[PDB]
Design a protein around this ligand. Structure first.
Ligand SMILES: [Ca+2]
Ligand SMILES: [Ca+2]
Ligand SMILES: [Ca+2]
Ligand SMILES: [Ca+2]
Ligand SMILES: [Ca+2]
Ligand SMILES: [Ca+2]
Lengths: 321, 321, 321
């Protein structure tokens, strides 16, 4: 018989939590925690908004000293540098790429205003790593947190060296100069305020269109993890994000859990697909619902991801592989 | 006095139901039903997802044999062919246009990824019908059900030989590789899931912008017609669709009814417009509400459609024509 | 220590109410009311939909006679002229600019279909005022109330001589030829109908992206001011509009109040920023919530606007200036 892989029409993957640390104490504790939990979350060593101002050179060296060190056990430690209109952004790239025992897992670019700004920064990173004789290119992630970036967000998603786009909620709200209430930086405003909801969906649609990872902003709530876990669920199940920032180690497990695979999907996919197979991939009826190749795709996507990620697939599903 | 037609600033129309049949038995039963009900719905003879795979040539000939036959009583029978990246799509066009006693009412193109893909297919259809000496061009309808089509959906709406765009809900959800839950293929998820709601509104706005018909996806619910009728109402009254696909003959009357004209609108339009006329088309007050030429347009659109479609217009409305 | 102005990353302002009058009696009463209340609202002397048809030349002269007259006390009186596809639009510009003792505060262009249409009209206004030896250029405001304008609404926001975009709700609904129910011209439909909500957010995002004023459509409700006041609140707090049209003098105070500054914001901003300052503009904790430079921006925007507009700022905030 025919397999779904050969009859059905036609994805980006990074760890689901991006944990930010902007000071040495937090970096070291995060790194230690990553060793305990394993690489279920990335760590971003932050030079920008997560850090105080004034020690820019010293800070980039601190960051560089941790990359590929004894604390970086999995190679899942990236960085965020300064913005294009900042004096130290090239110095961040040079200091960090020169001194890091291993290159950062990715470089996060904040406050992109124009498409050319991002491309130029991506290009400088490539050039620098090329001359330092670094083996592979360094992935870049872009913040979409200005008017300019949101307007051209599809152009950003399309950029070659860019693996993900992240929403900058606070900067985006602040960018409206008070026209959007600060309640939009908290939940549920950050999901329900029409302009913020609109921006999040643009970023998400753009990422999916170009096979990039849509990364959700942090929850600034540092007490109620119940809120944080709910944010992560809405980002995932309503907004189509596949990753989310963390700003406190207690957020990490709530976020990772929210993005865990739903194993409940696997038996359903198996049943539907086996039946589809028997109907020669023509339309079928399942539980008062019509299915055809357009929905089969979904369930094959579900089975494919499950088997790939070494999740339990029913023996019945064998003739689909 | 002055008529609305001469003072007011400044539409596409197809049957409101597009009934799909992908097998001979269903095609023949649909055709028979169309003869009974008259052409209140179109029929699309389906070569793609509504049909099993493997008999592609035989299937296109079956389809071609029904077009303009004794069963095709009104010329309101179209087809859906294979996609641009499929081997048999040109063969579908040639086999069907060559053998059909009368050309299809339209040709539906599934899974458009790029604007050039669609244009090229539209162009091949024109060329083929031109060489076969077919008298008029064959209208094309495009599925918007990929990332590429949604991104450039306004460019699609603008294409010259394209009369309508249809939303492919299942393919669109599947296109997100699991990021959108399968609950978004069912109601109310298919209206309330932010990314699906977003896609539907883009397609709709694009169609209206370029005078094309926005055609809504089928309800996959084949038991509860109450659900199907509600879907059709939301597609119409919230999303601005003017047509909807049917996948089961029991859906057809629910869909056709949902898109029926609201005669309640006609007396209101008459009253408002006659009063506007007397105020020399300056602003008026009607029921605690201010009206001016911007709203008069709406009510003239309502009267114009009613009189055109031979619906009952009050004798009082005479000085508006 | 360091001030927010020197560490933080990175606005258009017009009166919050745009009161329309399309007849001499209403213009004169509006002008008198503006003298009483002071310039808390603009007045637009209307030649288009707010006026009856047929006296076009006489009407433009009436309008021109009031600009800069004894009734125009503050220079906050603009006009709306006819559309690009109208015969009298150039005549409106010439008659009005030639005869007005002082130039209009702005010129509102209705029913823009294409970007070039608007640019061309903006250019004619510049040319005319230049040859009449008028000292400064006349600001233009564009109506976004057609399909063509909404599609290219970001291109419109970007136009050099354009200070604001206004949503034309009734024309926009009417533009869909009945596909959008007339209930979308009333509240809550005008906020909740998905296509109208979508259009309003596009206009708003575009204006903010290019530093223009987003101006909300009028409430056509002329009895219940409670409705009007609620409309203004949703336009402001959900949709990000900073101005709203008025069509009845009783609407004016409800609209102006809805857009009044929230003084409650000032102490919060002060507290957060003073603390940020002490942490060397690194991240801080405030009330179970994490803050960093991305949110500080918001609160600095709040303080800056308060001090500028001569509102009461706490003595504690001194080291932030
Ligand atoms: Ca940010
Ligand atoms: Ca609590
Ligand atoms: Ca489909
Ligand atoms: Ca039931
Ligand atoms: Ca209007
Ligand atoms: Ca009342």
């Amino acid at each position: 018989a025919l397999t779904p892989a050969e009859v059905l029409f036609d994805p980006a993957v990074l760890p689901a939590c991006d944990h930010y640390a902007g000071s040495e104490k937090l970096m070291l504790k995060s790194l230690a925690l990553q060793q305990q939990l394993g690489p279920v979350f990335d760590i971003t060593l932050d030079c920008e908004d997560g850090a105080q101002v004034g020690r820019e050179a010293q800070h980039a060296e601190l960051v560089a000293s941790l990359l590929g060190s004894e604390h970086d056990r999995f190679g899942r430690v990236g960085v965020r540098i300064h913005d294009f209109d900042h004096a130290h952004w090239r110095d961040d790239v040079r200091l960090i790429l020169r001194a890091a025992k291993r290159a950062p897992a990715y470089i996060t670019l904040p406050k992109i205003r124009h498409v050319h700004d991002a491309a130029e920064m991506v290009a400088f990173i490539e050039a620098t790593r090329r001359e330092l004789g670094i083996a592979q290119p360094v992935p870049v992630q872009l913040l979409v947190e200005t008017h300019g970036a949101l307007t051209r967000v599809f152009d950003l998603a399309a950029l070659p060296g860019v693996e993900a786009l992240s929403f900058g909620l606070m900067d985006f709200v602040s960018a409206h100069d008070g026209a959007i209430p600060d309640t939009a930086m908290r939940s549920p405003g950050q999901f329900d305020h029409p302009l913020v909801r609109r921006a999040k969906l643009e970023i998400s649609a753009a990422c999916h269109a170009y096979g990039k990872v849509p990364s959700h902003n942090v929850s600034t709530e540092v007490r109620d993890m119940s809120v944080v876990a709910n944010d992560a669920a809405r980002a995932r199940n309503e907004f189509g994000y596949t990753r989310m920032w963390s700003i406190h180690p207690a957020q990490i497990e709530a976020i990772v859990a929210a993005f865990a695979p739903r194993d409940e999907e696997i038996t359903t996919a198996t049943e539907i697909l086996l039946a589809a197979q028997s109907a020669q991939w023509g339309p079928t009826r399942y539980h008062d619902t019509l299915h055809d190749r357009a929905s089969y795709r979904y369930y094959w996507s579900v089975l494919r991801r499950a088997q790939a990620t070494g999740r339990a697939v029913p023996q019945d599903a064998a003739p689909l592989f």
